[PDB]
Design a protein around this ligand. Sequence first.
Ligand SMILES: Cn1cnnc1C1CCN(c2ncccc2-c2ccc(F)nc2)CC1
Ligand SMILES: [Co+2]
Length: 326
Amino acid sequence: SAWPEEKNYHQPAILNSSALRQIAEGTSISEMWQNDLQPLLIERYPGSPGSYAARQHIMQRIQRLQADWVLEIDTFLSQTPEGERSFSNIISTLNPTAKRHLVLACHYDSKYFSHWNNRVFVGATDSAVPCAMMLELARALDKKLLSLKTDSKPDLSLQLIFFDGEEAFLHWSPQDSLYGSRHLAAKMASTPHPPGARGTSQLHGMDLLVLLDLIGAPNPTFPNFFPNSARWFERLQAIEHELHELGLLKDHSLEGRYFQNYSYGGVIQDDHIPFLRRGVPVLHLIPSPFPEVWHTMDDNEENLDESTIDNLNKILQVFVLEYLHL
Ligand SMILES: Cn1cnnc1C1CCN(c2ncccc2-c2ccc(F)nc2)CC1
Ligand SMILES: [Co+2]
């Protein structure tokens, strides 16, 4: 069976003008700010009070949606620099037994830092905002998504991952990093899918991994990293332009735009690595450069850009709708 190949040929359903208008009007940046983003701007390294609440906040937010979301906690112990630690990835699937899933993901953990001048690192852009935008997407699209509960469709739904312990504890290295991802990846790699199949694993299931990281500084530039996924990048470029055209953005210029058609110099380590090395198509939505306030106490809410997150919300939402033909 050649269904793992279905993703290679899969095409989008290009929304038309008024559709795009209606998506734009559908997402409230401020609803998100207050309810999605704000609660997560807390110290939330693994095992911390913040961790448990962060995790509880996310499931609270999803559980309140009507689309038949299936939540699931990948909790595991692993050795670390600071000694043994419990990690818990949050997965959220619509239609889990569907062969194919588009997958959005980020990291809910934050990096550890000593309380330099009674200040606390909350990792705004890194990646509380990614988390919020995902949860906003989940909301903004509830009605539309609820239809994926019902002959004439590809066997494809949506999945959200929120990886834990992405961040390094001490020195970033193969073994002090990507704790959450490394584990789930290996688990998926060996979990048969669909249940009772020969050969094909849950990783065959991931049509595409869309990984949001370090998002919320103004004027981010995303490079196109992956050739094997460069066509979806192009859709993102198109959608950005389209909405700009219809004037459905706020404070945006084509000269100062987000998705640039250039490649990237080095190779960026993130949650996608364990997936990508197993031949998942990845779409790495991480800005190059990173925000100024990267791994600083300045990575705070004072320093996010309201308009930038909102615009991206609009872009990412259209992308996903088109990807799912909704
Ligand atoms: C993806 N992400 C989110 N927050 N920080 C990151 C990256 C992870 C990969 N990075 C590294 N790559 C190679 C060697 C070291 C690092 C690194 C990671 C964390 C840190 F504090 N300092 C360096 C840069 C920061
Ligand atoms: Co970081």
